[PDB]
Subunit: 355 residues, 4 copies
């Protein structure tokens, strides 16, 4: 609610091409298909093959920034991106060679930041996942066994064994309920009353494990990435130690590209920003072009009024952002700073039109 995400977060074309590339599989997988487009998309594999391959050797030019680096992850797919289709072409002479479109699926995961953020937390909380998983194994066979006791008599063909009744556990416990084999007697139907009750409590915890410290990590990602963009601000020599931990939870940083709009005039004032690197276009008769280490919006937050200038991203600006409360928090946190923002709430009134 308090950020301007721009400049193509889904930027690199290395990620883009797996999307059209993998859909090239399906037409090959289908009978009664004309040979025209059958082979036309096979080229598109060769294109993406050639495309990454063109990228590839430029990636294997890893003399860029070569001081100390850990690029086993980022290289691990680019290598196999072209080898696996290549060796696939010859040994697998039949058209099944295309079934190695399991390979590009890591290419999104190659440059998928937020995926290492995922795997980071599992190596702390998997202590719980296992005891829950074992417990899920407890509750599975503890329950899957209870049915073989009963309907093996009149349902041999469906419940004439245990693992057939392990199927009907997770189908019945994991909220799904296909509808292939269902009991007939009374007692087997009684048992389900706790099953759904159980699995919705298990997953009521187990899925809870993920979002639990995940949110800690994503809420943490807004700090580790943003203890930077702190010292750059010329004013923040006076902020107390504990003051910052209160604040940085809310301040998210994103970048706007050149030419784009930051805050349009007349739209309702609801937030203020801290420019820290780049430049803007404060649309006034004398443009107050504020560069690295500036801010604007207090003119709108103190009064609660529309925007006083169409600020456009004249360049690629690394932006911060902040709504009222957490700035009202700051104005409440210290009178020493509200003074200059009161002054600035008068200076920028005349300094917007003047120089």
């Amino acid at each position: 609610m308090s950020v301007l995400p721009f400049l193509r977060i889904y930027a690199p074309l290395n990620a883009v091409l797996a999307a059209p590339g993998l859909l090239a599989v399906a037409a090959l997988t289908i009978p009664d298909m004309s040979g025209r487009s059958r082979l036309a998309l096979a080229a598109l594999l060769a294109v993406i093959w050639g495309a990454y391959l063109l990228q590839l050797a430029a990636t294997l030019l890893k003399r860029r920034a070569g001081v100390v680096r850990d690029r086993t992850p980022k290289i691990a797919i680019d290598v196999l991106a072209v080898l696996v289709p290549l060796a696939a072409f010859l040994l697998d002479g039949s058209p099944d060679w295309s079934l190695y479109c399991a390979v590009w699926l890591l290419k999104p995961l190659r440059d998928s930041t937020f995926f290492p953020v995922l795997g980071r937390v599992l190596a702390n909380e998997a202590r719980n996942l296992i005891g829950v998983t074992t417990l899920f194994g407890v509750v599975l066979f503890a329950v899957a066994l209870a049915a073989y006791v009963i309907e093996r008599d009149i349902q041999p063909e469906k419940f004439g064994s245990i693992p057939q009744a392990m199927w009907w556990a997770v189908v019945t416990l994991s909220t799904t309920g296909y509808g292939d084999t269902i009991p007939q007697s009374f007692a087997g139907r009684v048992l389900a009353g706790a099953v759904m009750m159980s699995g919705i409590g298990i997953f009521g915890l187990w899925a809870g494990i993920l979002a639990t410290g995940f949110y800690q990590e994503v809420r943490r990602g807004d700090f580790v990435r943003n203890w930077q963009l702190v010292a750059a601000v010329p004013l923040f020599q006076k902020l107390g130690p504990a003051v910052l931990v209160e604040i940085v939870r809310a301040l998210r940083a994103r970048t706007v590209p050149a030419g784009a709009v930051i805050c349009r005039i007349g739209e309702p004032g609801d937030r203020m920003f801290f420019v820290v690197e780049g430049s803007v276009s404060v649309a006034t008769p004398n443009p107050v072009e504020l560069g690295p280490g500036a801010f604007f919006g207090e003119m709108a937050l103190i009064s609660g009024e529309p925007r006083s200038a169409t600020v456009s991203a004249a360049t690629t600006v690394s932006l911060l952002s902040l709504h009222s409360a957490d700035f009202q928090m700051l104005c409440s946190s210290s009178p020493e700073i509200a003074e200059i923002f009161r002054k600035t709430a008068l200076e920028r009134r005349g300094a917007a039109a003047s120089a």
Copy 2:
């Protein structure tokens, strides 16, 4: 638990009429229907058509409050509300013209506050939704492919391709489980054990994304809307800076209309209010009619007793509200204020009967 929502939160009849209006579709959509009510409800479309149309030109009288406004949203439907049925009437001569009852569906969304509250947060957290969505695309085809490996042999008609096995992914991953095509072999049945386990972890995060900062925003909505109704209170010149941020999270403001009841006598005392605009009917022999900027309930919270007066909303009062703890928080937060509320807990005892 601590608010009196009244005066028709679902007020404007512009929103009301889409409900009966859209149900007018269904009778037209059905064979063997008598022509009587077939056309009778077609009028009701003309009524709502005419009704908004009567409203429409009064809306196009947008000279009201015409200083600086952004009414592209609020107008965008009212225009199409009547044009699209109109042009539908002529070109689409067959009864299918009624299928443009897809149009009024925005009319609730026209004046649906809390809908902009929804879209506000997606433009900050969609950084995550995409990486999760791609990851959902990873896990889909990573898994949907695993089955074509197997049952293409003995299930051509069901699993004789990939996208047929992409159907059976989300059906199987998204908790649903229709029951159209299910495996027969063992290994294809093993794979599902992680699928439901997976999708309930994916959605265990992904649905978590929504409620995560949504609640931040709704809990924030109780501040941005309620840093107002602060300075109006004559007593709040003494409240410290950090005192308020602690409080306003709990104080929600709503309005009661004239004539309605606010707190009835004898009911158990559980909360106190701050009147800030309007007037009441404190039902006493001398009615202590307290207008803008008052409060009552401390007589019940300090003692823990029933209500001392049937307070009725004599006018349309913009109300606040507060339970004990967060007022016990205030009484604990400062002795300076509990003095006057102790005094007021004696003054209003005699001042309730007297003037």
Copy 3:
């Protein structure tokens, strides 16, 4: 994790008898049933009828504590508990009179505390439930209409109308997936990809609405019920104002009945209690029988050792409870109090054996 709930929380037999009473329905509802038990359980209705009826007039003796009371809820069922079966007996001569076992279902809800706790919060947050519910009505027909566009041609008998396709929305949107009518074409199958994605986000919020402030209320229930049992403690004249709000979130009060066990000797020490009313049996050679306004467990928490005495509930004690951290919080919160608890950690060592 930090409380001893005892003395029959499911106490009153008024609540108990609906459980056996309603199961008396089913045998009447079944063909080929012998008349023996058919009428035998009809008596049990007369028993519960007579049982509450015996209770009833004693309830209508509402001269007990008759000062100011609001007993429209608690009476509203007891009246109908016996009238509705009575009038059912005569006018409904056929056995369908038993179908008024819809009536006792409120009797649990009669004395179901925690049910008013439920309805309390809906009257503050239903502002959201409606906009979400309308939004659910938006997303229903916005989506349910998209299918009639398509399969009306080759699925008249299943999708030959709109509301048939409204059925297949919530079945498909609300995680359920029966398996009655499913598409055949491609495009109708594409649409479901966002449906489950959508409904799991809708309910990802909407069910979130309930648990959101519900937990605020239940976490609040541990305060409003426990600002009592504060002043009774002889030591709590020194506790600062803000000290208490930190504490009472954790302190839950429950009651133990006479004769029961409170802490058995030798079990691992993990918590301490505050006795405020009643008496105990501190099993020592000289029983240190501590009555209203006492505590014990610091002997185990400071050392981290087993229990030093088999404390048994000699009488019905209104108990509090507290684990280490929130007491380590207290020991950390003030040196003034840890002194007496250090002294008490020596006094009760010798005073346990002596008098």
Copy 4:
């Protein structure tokens, strides 16, 4: 995200053998099976039988640490682990004796820490589970009855009774939706609109009950287990009282075994540790082998640089761990401590190569 879990958290072979042991059931449960492996796995039961039996008498040697102990749980299965198969062998002469592989299922639960953590909280919050469970019983039969009113006429064979319509409640309310018996009329189909809406709100609370204070307990488990490893640190005589409660929520302790790696050189610096018992291998020309009560990582966190030494677990070290923010919290929490960590950020620069 901030811990190094190592040394075989799933360690004891008592837990390990139930996994292969129980799968020995299934081959016996199947017709047309060759007798070779039929009896081969029956030995494996005898192995695990003998294996625990070998363990058993060594467990019944409970003269180890025999001062005051409560080992009814840990013994309760080991006894039955071998008796129940034994008596099963003789009385149950037919192969059904193997159906007492319901017995080993507690053996994981024997040494499943985190399982007592589960049952601990239910004895405080089951006050809610019951009122919700009764409420679930309210909503079940309140709704399951509504359908017998309707389709008993034209669906006798499916809805010719009540409990058949109690089946179709939880199937329909608990998110599952098998697809055995579904209505035909309109009104019975209307009713489901609130059912899924209801059950997803019920479980929206009820599953919420579990994760609610569960997370309190697991977040508490990181304190009760970690008020230890506090006094061992030589520096923590100066930490204020309230300072610790802020910190210990984040500090989790785990153990690394001998020979393993702790932080490899060159990997990105993201965390620091407190060694409290054991020894390391700080891979430098002069190995700065720091034993019980040390720390490292400030060299990387103050600068934000890679690791300055391949620290390997030379012995079994009981480790703590800490990311930046909560250490930046500490550096912000006190200048008195950042001094020595500034000094240490210079001492260990030269003391890493020197002695």
